[PDB]
Design a protein around this ligand. Structure first.
Ligand SMILES: Nc1ncnc2c1ncn2[C@H]1C[C@H](O)[C@@H](COP(=O)(O)OP(=O)(O)OP(=O)(O)O)O1
Ligand SMILES: [Mg+2]
Ligand SMILES: [Mg+2]
Ligand SMILES: [Mn+2]
Length: 758
DNA sequence: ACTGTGGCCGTGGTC
DNA sequence: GACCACGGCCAC
């Protein structure tokens, strides 16, 4: 099984390394034969003789074109003749590419920014993570001596916990009488023992939770302070701390550093992403949190360090269990994209689509278009029309069927051959013409992306079958994440068409897909309501809720299924409308916001404050209870009583602060907020107190009693002292609870005055 | 920061 | 007060 590639430099020449696991043995394979290259398109071939003479000077050594070779390739399906320029070292390509491009005979250059080791994986047809090879894994975590406002890493590490399938242990340097603690003499000894555990266990995978940004950097700093070589690489190397935008990522040569946070952050939607909150969300069970003060208070007194050791051991054990659950999903994406698990687990979905396309283009001899320059970016700025959203019917409806197209946009792309290499391709036998926007797509030959999307859909359907048949609820949920992941990837091929920085950008493709989408769903709404007696209650892009007014549950189900058998034979290609759900009762508040209840009594909520991380829990809890009373008990006065009870508790300061916290992400550097709302105001004030705030920081705040700008009374949630400050009851009533529940209860004739406390 | 557009809603800046 | 950009997050 291939894990990763890189290259090293020996005597000026690049040597590729393939890291592999085979029959239980770790192997490094060296390849000295691979030559870096890019392509130049010339005004004509006589110019190759002058183009070959372009040089560049890098660090006092002359970079030259090693060898030029004329090749025939396709570009958007059309023959093209380009010159393949070979070089003696990968660094030669960035040193020379601008000067090759500036040559007056050179129309353009291509495939000049592809990292050498990834170029090798693609060109040699190598797919990481293929095979039945069983890989060993090891999680670890650290506990540090923290005091607020010191520079990063000034405090000693106190404990290092690690866990695999067989054990979970804590290494520390103070006496804790627990069976899973190993006490050693010093912090230096603790780290050195951790290093030996990893050398001796020799895991293929190292699992952390935010190791990219905290754990490895802390260890590195302590190793520097104590004079330790931080050997974890299988080749003796230290961890390599590469930059990724505003964050970092940490590589361990010969192993896969699997940092869970990026994967968790993009898979699960939570208001905060503590390890405790993630563990609870995945496994449905609590994890205790011991805080930095509690840690420091224990360390400096000697007392109650058992709890700290327990907390550390659980960190590692939970990190391991989370790692085991999610690794198969990342391994599969790794095989689908053809890049290392280390890369795919950290990559944006945009880069994944691009890397997939680059590989497939190589197999097809399709020259890749370039990422756009600033001028082309500028001319790509226009938007385009998206999906149709029907304003919902007001009120409480019974016997609601939910119908929804399977993999709609990908299905449109394949069925209508929507691709840049088919757009307005001239002199063709057959065309599909997009409605409204008019773009013509040739059907004579399969388009590049259309030809690739099917397998993705089949891969998703294969997972979905395994899911719906899987009994164990935890495995079923992880299979649900997995099938959603392949679904999001498939739809990201559509979105890639309208992505400004995309290589195979094609706005005409993007807007053709949405245009077909609007026509299909509006045709379904029309057929249902004009011919089959349904009332469509709500509709969003490719799905719809409908009922037959006055009909019993089984009549609606029967007519809905009859409609599916009437409509689907009339749909072209892969287009299929699916029966997705039936709800005995349901309520549509506005576009994007509704709630239904199935025959088993489960309420499904969309878009309502219940669902959002940025509303307080007292607002979301109360909304949930109101919805249950209405949807499950039919009882609206209970709902009203519920609200009136909660507003009475807020007034009397009888609601606990936890339910008052608002959570909002900082999404950008603090300095380029054009407007400063509460979470930004809090952030900036923490920033001024020397706290690192960066994109992805989740601000947690509570609004104190006062008047004026909310931002002037918002404080960090952890600073709310219920004795010294009092929360702003009026704010939580009139700005949190009542807006959330009034949007529901107004349907029943209730006004806010009906809901407040005396 | 990087797959797309449609959309609701709170906050606080401008008159 | 009206007006309405900004920002966050959600449904597709
Ligand atoms: N994350 C997304 N990125 C881009 N386009 C999206 C995204 N989610 C939804 N869309 C678009 C493409 C989908 O085909 C369309 C309808 O959404 P949806 O019903 O959730 O997905 P789907 O039809 O692809 O899958 P499914 O088989 O679950 O119904 O909206
Ligand atoms: Mg849908
Ligand atoms: Mg004025
Ligand atoms: Mn769908």
């Amino acid at each position: 099984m291939i894990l990763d590639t890189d290259y090293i430099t020996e005597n000026g020449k690049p040597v590729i390394r393939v890291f592999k696991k085979e029959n239980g043995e770790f192997k490094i394979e060296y390849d000295r034969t691979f030559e870096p290259y890019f392509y130049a398109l010339l005004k004509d071939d006589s110019a190759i003789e002058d183009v070959k003479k372009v040089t560049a000077k890098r660090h006092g050594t002359v970079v030259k074109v090693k060898r030029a070779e004329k090749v025939q390739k396709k570009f958007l399906g059309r023959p093209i003749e380009v010159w393949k320029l070979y070089f003696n070292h990968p660094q030669d390509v960035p040193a020379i590419r601008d000067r090759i491009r500036a040559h007056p005979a050179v129309v353009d250059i291509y495939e000049y920014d592809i990292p050498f080791a990834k170029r090798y994986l693609i060109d040699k047809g190598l797919i990481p993570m293929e095979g039945d090879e069983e890989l060993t894994m090891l999680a670890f975590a650290i506990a540090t001596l923290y005091h607020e406002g010191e520079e990063f890493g000034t405090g000693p590490i106190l404990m290092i916990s690690y866990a695999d399938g067989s054990e979970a242990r804590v290494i520390t340097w103070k006496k804790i009488d627990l069976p899973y603690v190993d006490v050693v003499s010093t912090e230096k000894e603790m780290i050195k023992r951790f290093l030996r555990v990893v050398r001796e266990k020799d895991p293929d995978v190292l699992i952390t939770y935010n190791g990219d940004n905290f754990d490895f950097a802390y260890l590195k700093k302590r190793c520097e302070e104590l004079g330790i070589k931080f050997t974890l690489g299988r080749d003796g190397s230290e961890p390599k701390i590469q930059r990724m935008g505003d964050r970092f990522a940490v590589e361990v040569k010969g192993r896969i550093h699997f940092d869970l946070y990026p994967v968790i952050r993009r898979t699960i939607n939570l208001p905060t992403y503590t390890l405790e909150a993630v563990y609870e969300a995945v496994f449905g069970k609590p994890k205790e949190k011991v805080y930095a003060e509690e840690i420091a208070q224990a360390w400096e007194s000697g007392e109650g360090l058992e709890r700290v050791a327990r907390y550390s051991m659980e960190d590692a054990k939970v990190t391991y269990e989370l790692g085991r659950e999610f690794f198969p999903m990342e391994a599969q994406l790794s095989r689908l994209i053809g890049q290392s698990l280390w890369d795919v687990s950290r990559s944006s979905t945009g880069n994944l689509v691009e890397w997939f396309l680059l590989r497939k283009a190589y197999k097809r001899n399709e020259l890749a278009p370039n990422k756009p320059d600033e001028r082309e970016l500028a001319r790509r700025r226009g938007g385009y029309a998206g999906g149709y959203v029907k304003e919902p019917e007001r009120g409480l409806w019974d016997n609601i069927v939910y119908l929804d197209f399977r993999s709609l946009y990908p299905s449109i792309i394949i069925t209508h051959n929507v691709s840049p290499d088919t757009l307005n391709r001239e002199g063709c036998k057959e065309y599909d013409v997009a409605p409204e926007v008019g773009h013509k797509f040739c059907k004579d030959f399969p388009g590049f992306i259309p030809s690739l999307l099917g397998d993705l859909l089949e891969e998703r359907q294969k997972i979905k079958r395994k899911m719906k048949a899987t009994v164990d609820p935890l495995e079923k949920k992880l299979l649900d994440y997995r099938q959603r992941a392949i679904k999001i990837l498939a739809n990201s091929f559509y979105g890639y068409y309208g992505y400004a920085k995309a290589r195979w950008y094609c706005k005409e493709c993007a807007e053709s897909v949405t245009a077909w989408g609007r026509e299909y769903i509006e045709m379904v709404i029309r057929e249902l309501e004009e011919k089959f007696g349904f009332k469509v209650l709500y509709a969003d892009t490719d799905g719809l809720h409908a009922t037959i007014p006055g009909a019993d549950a089984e009549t609606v189900k029967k007519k809905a299924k009859e409609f599916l058998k009437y409509i689907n034979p009339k749909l072209p290609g892969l287009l299929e409308l699916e029966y997705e759900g039936f709800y005995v009762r349901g309520f549509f508040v506005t576009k994007k916001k509704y709630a239904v209840i199935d025959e088993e009594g489960k309420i499904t909520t969309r878009g309502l404050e219940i669902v959002r991380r940025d509303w307080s829990e007292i607002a979301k809890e109360t909304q949930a209870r109101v919805l249950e009373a209405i949807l499950k008990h039919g009882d609206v006065e209970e709902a009203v009583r519920i609200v009136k009870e909660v507003t009475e508790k807020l007034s009397k300061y009888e609601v606990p602060p936890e339910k008052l916290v608002i959570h909002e992400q900082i999404t950008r550097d603090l300095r380029d907020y054009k407007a400063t709302g509460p979470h930004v105001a809090v952030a900036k004030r923490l920033a001024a107190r020397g706290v690192k705030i960066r994109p992805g920081t989740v601000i947690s705040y509570i609004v104190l009693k006062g008047s004026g700008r909310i931002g002037d009374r918002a404080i960090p949630a952890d600073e709310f002292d219920p004795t010294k400050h009092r929360y702003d009851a009026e704010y939580y009533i009139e700005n949190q609870v009542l807006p959330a529940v009034e949007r529901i209860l107004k349907a029943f004739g209730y006004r806010k005055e009906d809901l407040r406390y005396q």
